Symmetry: T
Subunit: 68 residues, 12 copies
């Protein structure tokens, strides 16, 4: 049937988790076609000094491969 590929990215943002997810996906869309789903693997981040500096979300992005 169809075949998909998964790439692992890390999105970062000062805004929050959804924004860091959206950041990776926005960059993914520049170079990968047929983006279909994602799976969060890790949530981490840096500290300083209003608390969280940046949120870092490690995620797999899954996309459909074309025929050839």
């Amino acid at each position: 049937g169809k075949v998909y590929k998964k790439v692992e990215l890390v999105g970062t943002s000062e805004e929050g988790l959804e924004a860091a997810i959206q950041a990776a996906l926005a960059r993914a869309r520049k170079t990968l076609r047929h983006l279909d789903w994602f799976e969060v693997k890790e949530i981490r981040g840096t500290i300083g000094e209003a608390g969280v500096k940046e949120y870092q979300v490690v995620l797999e992005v899954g996309f459909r491969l074309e025929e050839t």
Copy 2:
């Protein structure tokens, strides 16, 4: 000794992660009694042209069983 049961749900939301959890809990409250705690097992979601179509949070909800 009190006994609890855990049911696994996946809440979804186009808005965010809290909203997805809340969606699941709102539905669980309709058919399950004595809801006490939840544990998130997975965060995933779907992608469209806008980016995230929906956030999906897989979680277990634990509740106390009667008698």
Copy 3:
């Protein structure tokens, strides 16, 4: 020594598990060279009116990098 890369693919088929793995490997052959091994990570699928609709096998495929 030699250096390998692993790509993660999801093969799908209505027929069964091996055919799902085979579907991923046939596509991988078109763009990847020196395919050597694979490792299954997840077996999942969709459900239709007759039972399984498609099997989906998530696998890592390992191949030698040139140079």
Copy 4:
């Protein structure tokens, strides 16, 4: 907005892995509506004179809940 539930079943069969999965899904269909997807968690089995006696596939079945 949408909420799914997951139940954990063990399908068994003497015929093979796919058959064991089909067995769980067939029995699932009798009492669960909107069956959407499955996830295989464990493949195990019993052993007899002729090798495999029964294949046992532990899977989660996900299905959409009504509001």
Copy 5:
């Protein structure tokens, strides 16, 4: 062939690990038929003035489904 279902329960007891498991099974057998096996997934508990307040054992209980 036969089809089984697993339900996840948490038994509790102020006495010990076995007693907590038995509490869960004793309750299970009031609403579930054909109980066959259990599998412990987690041991946790709460803490009081005297050490352990209650033991909490998270377990899966497996039972045959009737062909309904």
Copy 6:
């Protein structure tokens, strides 16, 4: 080289996931120096009449040790 330590904290908040993480970091920074990074290990919470009562985020906080 440098040596870091990780401590496991659980932040809580009635507001959301980021707020819970910030609660833990805000407390961490009162007794720990040189906070560098955090890693989320679990998200759980409690349930009330209105859905989520409080969100509880389990996280590791990593900080450099002073060569003492």
Copy 7:
């Protein structure tokens, strides 16, 4: 009560997952007594010109120990 041992084998076959499991179990039968159950731990394999070369199934075989 009674005591069981588990050994970890890897069965291989060009002819699929069930075939590889059966290969392991046939060999286990030759030198092990009181074979009772198996648990699949990994599925992997090698790749050749036609896709899968060999399927390799890593499993635990459980057997009762005599007293």
Copy 8:
């Protein structure tokens, strides 16, 4: 929002599993305040001529931090 800390201990006992947990909690109570919950991570132990020399239970203890 209240904040908790988790410390990892290994309690040991020649008697049994509960006793090992209790050993750890008794010691934790000496230097940690507001002890609330524990989670067992590992059960292991040592072996002598008698069989089990000591049971060892690795656990996290969670307690509320002040200010």
Copy 9:
């Protein structure tokens, strides 16, 4: 240095967890020398009908290998 081997056993008992652990170890001692430690992997069991029939503890037993 020294080399050890680990075998995986399943001890069973109606008495409880420690007894099922002791059961595997007693049988291990019949055929393996220099038993040194064990690690519990799984706790499961059968049901009927005073609750637990038998407790089943899956464990690795580690023992020192001799030179030759």
Copy 10:
């Protein structure tokens, strides 16, 4: 903010763990830009007459994506 990608490589060497890591990283440097960190995922190897033949280290290499 910025976005990173991770690729999974297997470095090999007859000369040890660090050597295998370095082999992977040297190859990564040839076709990947902005290499920042690595995470070891598995250590395995092959066996020959003298013990270890090749050390094989599976690692993730993280690098910043240009915009």
Copy 11:
């Protein structure tokens, strides 16, 4: 009877894996008494012009508590 505590450290070094472990243990010795054993949890690192810049080994250090 006996109770141990475990702390999670990250040793770093430019020299290799063993050196990074030794670095954590040396700093551990300054403030912790009765250091008994360690468990490596993660091996990771940073990458520079010459390949590995810093090795980072995340380990748990276990030590015996006084009564």
Copy 12:
């Protein structure tokens, strides 16, 4: 096809990680035939006055069964 067995060993050495792996493999050679691969599962060790006392590497060793 061919069938393999995996035995789990713990190699120990004061020198380092490879020497620990080598110690396990040298002993395995005395009693096991057709040793083919190994997989590291855990790296741990003991601590003495100078830092690491012994490294202990837990590994699975895979070998072909005759027949």
